[PDB]
Design a protein around this ligand. Structure first.
Ligand SMILES: Cc1cc2nc3c(=O)[nH]c(=O)nc-3n(C[C@H](O)[C@H](O)[C@H](O)COP(=O)(O)OP(=O)(O)OC[C@H]3O[C@@H](n4cnc5c(N)ncnc54)[C@H](O)[C@@H]3O)c2cc1C
Ligand SMILES: O=C(O)c1cc(Oc2ccc(C(F)(F)F)cc2Cl)ccc1[N+](=O)[O-]
Length: 414
C-alpha cells in the first residue's frame, strides 16, 4: 500500500487531496494519502470572515467562471446551490483629478487583434515592453498599467508576457463566502490524514522512500510527494537542488485589503459604478476601490454600503506595516477626495498580505521548466505546483493540483 503526502493545505493541496481520493475510490488503488498544513486552518489565501451580517473576503474575492476547473469542483463538491455571479456595472480609472470611464463583440475581438498584434520574437519579454512597443506610453501608464497592477500587484516592467498572457505568442462566488468551498472539502476528505499546525521543514531520501522532516521532529515516509507551499517555503525543503534557486529568488509583493461598512454616510461620488483603479501619476495611497454591494449585494446587509480598497504596490509597499489606524486613515483620507463620506465607518476590517502576490518575471516559464526537469531526474515522484508556478488564479491552482494528482499516479502505478 503506497503512501503520498501533500504539503500545503491551501486550494492547491485541497484540490489535489480531493481528486486524489476520488481516484483512490474508482480504481481501488492501494494508496494511502496524507496532507500536512502549517497553520491551524486549511484554505490558505482563501479566508472569509463575517461581522454584523457582513461577508468580507479578506483576500480571494471570486473566480473567473470560464475556467471550468473552478465551477466544476463546486459541482463535485455539491454546492451549485450557492453560485452567484457578479452584478455588472461601469468602472472608471482615476487619472489625476478626474474619473474617466473605460471606452465604449466582433468589433472588440478585432480592435484588440489590430491594437495588440501577436509577439514578433519568441523570447520572453515584459508586459511593459510588449505594450509600449505597439501602443503609446500615455496609454500604458494611464490605462493598461493601472489594470494589470490591480490583478498581479506587480511591476509591469518586470512581469513576464509569456507567463501572464501566453496567448500573445463573468465571475462567480459562493453566497456563503468563498471560504465555505474550502471547509466543504475538508469535511468530504475521508482517506486523507489531515495534519494541521505542522510544517514540513525538509524533504530527503531514506532508502526506497522519501523522508519528510517535520516541525515537531516526527519524520513521515512517502513514495510520492506533492508540494504546494509558496515559493519561499518550498525552496527551503530542497535548498540543495541547484534549480531550486529559481524558486527562492522569486518575489511576492505585499499588499493590503481594507473593507469598510457605511450606514449611508456614503453619499455616492459624481458617477456611480462598480469601482475604479488609480493611475500611476496620481500620487494616491490606495490602488483601487470597489463597491462590494453593487457587485455582490449578498455581501452587505441592505441599507448598508460595503466598500473595498486596496493598498500597496510593487516598489513602495511599506504602507502594509502601519497600524490599522494609519491604514484606515490613509484610505479615507484618499477615499474622501472623490466622494463625500459623511460620518465614520460603522464596520472596519483591515488585513495584510506580506508576500502573497507571486511575481512571474521574464523567463519565468523557462526557469520553472528547468526546475520541473531537475526534479524529474533527481527527485522522481516529487512534484511542486501552486500559485508560484503556472497561474495564481484559483481555477489555475485547482488544475495545477489536478495535474499533480495525475503525475503522482502515473509515477506510482501506470
Ligand atoms: C489578498 C489576496 C486576494 C486574492 N484575491 C483573489 C481573487 O479575487 N481571485 C482569484 O482567483 N485569486 C485571488 N487570490 C489568489 C488565490 O487566493 C491564490 O492563487 C490561491 O489561494 C493559492 O492557493 P495555493 O493552495 O496554491 O496556496 P496557499 O493558499 O498559499 O496555501 C499554501 C499552504 O501551504 C501551507 N504551508 C506553508 N509552509 C508549510 C510547511 N512547511 N508545512 C506545511 N504547510 C505549509 C500554508 O500555511 C498554506 O495554507 C488572492 C490572494 C491574496 C493573498
Ligand atoms: O492577483 C490575483 O491573484 C488576482 C487574480 C484574479 O483573476 C483574474 C483577473 C483578471 C482576469 C482578466 F483580466 F482576464 F479579466 C482573469 C482572472 Cl482569472 C482576480 C483578482 C486578483 N486580485 O489579486 O485581486
Amino acid at each position: 500500500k503506497k503512501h503520498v503526502v501533500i504539503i500545503g493545505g491551501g486550494i492547491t493541496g485541497l484540490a489535489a487531496a480531493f481528486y486524489m481520493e476520488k481516484e483512490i475510490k474508482e480504481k481501488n488503488l492501494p494508496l494511502e494519502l496524507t496532507l500536512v498544513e502549517a497553520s491551524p486552518r486549511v484554505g490558505g489565501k482563501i479566508q472569509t470572515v463575517k461581522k454584523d451580517g457582513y461577508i468580507i473576503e479578506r483576500g480571494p474575492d471570486s473566480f473567473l467562471e470560464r475556467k471550468k476547473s473552478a465551477p466544476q469542483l463546486v459541482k463535485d463538491l455539491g454546492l451549485e446551490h450557492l453560485l452567484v455571479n457578479n452584478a455588472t456595472g461601469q468602472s472608471y480609472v482615476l487619472v489625476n483629478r478626474t474619473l474617466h470611464p473605460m471606452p465604449k463583440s466582433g468589433k472588440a475581438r478585432a480592435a484588440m487583434d489590430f491594437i495588440l498584434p501577436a509577439s514578433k520574437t519568441k523570447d520572453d519579454q515584459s508586459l511593459g515592453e510588449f505594450f509600449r512597443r505597439r501602443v503609446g506610453d500615455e496609454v500604458v501608464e494611464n490605462l493598461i498599467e493601472p489594470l494589470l497592477s490591480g490583478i498581479y500587484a506587480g511591476d509591469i516592467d518586470k512581469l513576464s508576457l509569456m507567463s501572464t498572457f501566453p496567448q500573445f505568442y463573468q465571475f462567480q462566488t459562493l453566497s456563503t463566502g468563498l471560504q465555505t468551498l474550502v471547509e466543504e472539502i475538508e469535511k468530504q476528505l475521508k482517506l486523507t490524514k489531515v495534519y494541521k499546525g505542522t510544517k514540513v521543514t525538509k524533504l530527503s531520501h531514506s532508502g526506497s522512500c522519501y523522508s519528510l522532516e517535520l516541525d515537531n521532529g516526527v519524520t513521515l515516509d512517502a513514495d510520492s510527494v506533492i508540494v504546494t507551499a509558496p515559493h519561499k517555503a518550498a525552496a527551503g525543503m530542497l535548498s540543495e537542488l541547484p534549480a531550486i534557486s529559481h524558486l527562492k529568488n522569486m518575489h511576492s509583493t505585499s499588499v493590503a485589503n481594507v473593507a469598510l461598512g457605511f450606514p449611508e454616510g456614503s453619499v455616492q461620488m459624481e458617477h456611480e459604478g462598480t469601482g475604479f483603479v488609480i493611475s500611476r501619476n496620481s500620487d494616491f495611497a490606495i490602488t483601487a476601490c470597489t463597491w462590494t454591494n453593487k457587485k455582490w449585494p449578498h455581501a452587505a446587509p441592505e441599507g448598508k454600503t460595503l466598500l473595498r480598497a486596496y493598498v500597496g504596490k510593487a516598489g513602495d509597499e511599506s504602507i502594509v506595516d502601519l497600524s490599522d489606524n494609519d491604514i484606515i486613515n490613509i484610505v479615507l483620507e484618499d477615499l474622501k477626495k472623490v466622494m463625500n463620506i459623511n460620518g465614520e465607518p460603522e464596520m472596519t476590517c483591515v488585513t495584510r498580505w506580506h508576500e502573497s502576490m507571486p511575481q512571474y518575471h521574464v523567463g519565468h516559464k523557462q526557469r520553472i521548466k528547468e526546475l520541473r526537469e531537475a526534479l524529474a531526474s533527481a527527485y522522481p515522484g516529487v512534484y511542486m505546483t501552486g500559485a508560484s508556478f503556472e497561474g495564481v488564479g484559483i481555477p489555475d491552482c485547482i488544475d495545477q493540483g489536478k495535474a499533480a494528482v495525475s503525475d503522482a499516479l502515473t509515477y506510482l502505478f501506470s
